[PDB]
Design a protein around this ligand. Structure first.
Ligand SMILES: *[C@@H]1O[C@H](CO)[C@@H](O)[C@H](O)[C@H]1NC(C)=O
Ligand SMILES: [Zn+2]
Lengths: 215, 222
């Protein structure tokens, strides 16, 4: 069987400025019939993918010249000259040789000037607590880049592995992210402590900050 | 419109069954191979089956062989992927796709490079494979708020704010799977202090596979 490989896994790039992706295969790709069996696809965010290249270097109908697409054999490339903000998504090379098999992906996103998050804790609320649970959310707004390190704390005491975190996709206009971090507790150990606080470390911070509440 | 529509989908328990149709209008079906393709939530694109216009050379992914059954009605412009016996990893979204051909010979005994070209795609249909079922309660310069939405199965929920009057500043998060196999998520909204008391907000939640939809007045401290 064949193993499709691409690099990088994420490529934050800047509109105007070009970008390249690599895709490679565990076997060479050409024949049946001369030339290569590799397409490339975008999946713009919240959408079905669409044809981008075909037989390795052919530009499917209604595709900007911004997209050259090259290589042969095992090594391949999707070089986009002058990205525009709408080219965001995942690029998937694909292999047409033995049946069909899809690149692992390369996620394209906009480069942006750092930017710190605002923070916000939320208390359980006596309705959840009536039903016997304690979720304590902690927001992070409109930060870049993605990488953030949110850290929960009960009575000065860290926690480990009781926290799950979601992240919205890049923001379409300001290019930020956001992030929930939820720490769940038994209402019994909720009611038993007073100091709830999350402690964010983003790169756009000269030292961490923490939101805090009591009850 | 040249368009392709998936159908079927829906949740059913493991070792379940489903027949995804996929209808086509706006071109000559018979001129193209067709292809199922899945995306597990979170994961990347994984080809499934292929088939030609002469309704021959059915390929399948190892992950899928012996359980899915690619059919075709060039005279009824449709595509049928019969799914049995469904397991958890089978949970995904399913696109049917246009694809060029380019054939044989030095493939197996006669094979087809089923779709190098792949230019048209339905919207997808979603197939959820797990147990059990049913809804999940909501409960909740700048200052924020939103609602939690929790203990629900299956996906999706549609979180809204005052039915749409808040498009601004709403960060509504991807759903994450709690261990228990029920999801939860939070829908937040960034707002200037000010609004509290005069501006009052309500999160229009709608989970269908449940027959539940609510919304709840957020109002800090009293
Ligand atoms: C099957 O496909 C090829 C081109 O894709 C075409 O030449 C052949 O006639 C097709 N069979 C049909 C349209 O029934
Ligand atoms: Zn925001």
């Amino acid at each position: 069987d064949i193993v499709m490989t691409q690099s990088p896994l994420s490529l934050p790039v800047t509109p105007g400025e070009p970008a390249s992706i690599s895709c490679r295969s565990s076997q060479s790709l050409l024949h049946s019939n001369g030339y290569n069996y590799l397409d490339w696809y975008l999946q713009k965010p919240g959408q079905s993918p669409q044809l981008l290249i075909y037989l390795g270097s052919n530009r499917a109908s209604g595709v900007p010249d911004r997209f050259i697409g090259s290589g042969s054999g095992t090594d391949f490339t999707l070089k986009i000259s002058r990205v525009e903000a709408e080219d965001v998504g995942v690029f998937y090379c694909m292999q047409a040789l033995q049946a069909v098999g899809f690149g692992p992906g390369t996620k394209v996103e906009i480069k942006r000037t750092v930017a710190a998050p605002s923070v916000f804790i939320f208390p359980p609320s006596d309705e959840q607590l009536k039903s016997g649970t304690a979720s304590v959310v902690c927001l992070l707004n409109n930060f870049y880049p993605r990488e953030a390190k949110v850290q929960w704390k009960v009575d000065n005491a860290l926690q480990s592995g009781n926290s799950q975190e979601s992240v919205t996709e890049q923001d379409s206009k300001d290019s930020t992210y956001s992030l929930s971090s939820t720490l769940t507790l038994s209402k019994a150990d909720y009611e038993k402590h007073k100091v709830y606080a999350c402690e964010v470390t983003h790169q756009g911070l000269s030292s961490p900050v923490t939101k805090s509440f009591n009850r | 419109e040249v368009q392709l529509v998936e159908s079927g989908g829906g949740l059913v328990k493991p070792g379940g069954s489903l027949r995804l149709s996929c209808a086509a209008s706006g071109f000559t079906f018979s001129s193209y191979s067709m292809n199922w393709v899945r995306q597990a939530p979170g994961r990347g694109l994984e080809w499934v089956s292929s088939i030609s216009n002469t309704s021959t050379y059915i390929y399948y992914a190892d992950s899928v062989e012996g359980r899915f059954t690619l059919s075709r009605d060039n005279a009824k412009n449709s595509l049928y992927l019969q799914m049995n016996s469904l397991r958890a990893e089978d949970t995904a979204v399913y696109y049917c796709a246009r694809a060029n051909q380019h054939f044989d010979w030095l493939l197996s005994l006669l094979g087809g490079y089923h779709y190098y070209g792949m230019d048209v795609w339905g919207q997808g249909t979603t197939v959820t494979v797990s147990s059990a079922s049913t809804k999940g309660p909501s409960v909740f310069g700048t200052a924020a708020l939103g609602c939690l939405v929790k203990d629900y199965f299956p996906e999706p929920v549609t979180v809204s704010w005052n039915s749409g009057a808040l498009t601004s500043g709403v960060h509504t998060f991807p759903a994450v799977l709690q261990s228990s196999g029920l999801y939860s998520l939070s829908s937040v909204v960034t707002v200037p202090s000010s609004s509290l008391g005069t501006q009052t907000y309500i999160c229009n939640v709608n989970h269908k596979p449940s027959n539940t939809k609510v919304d709840k007045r957020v109002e800090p401290k009293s």
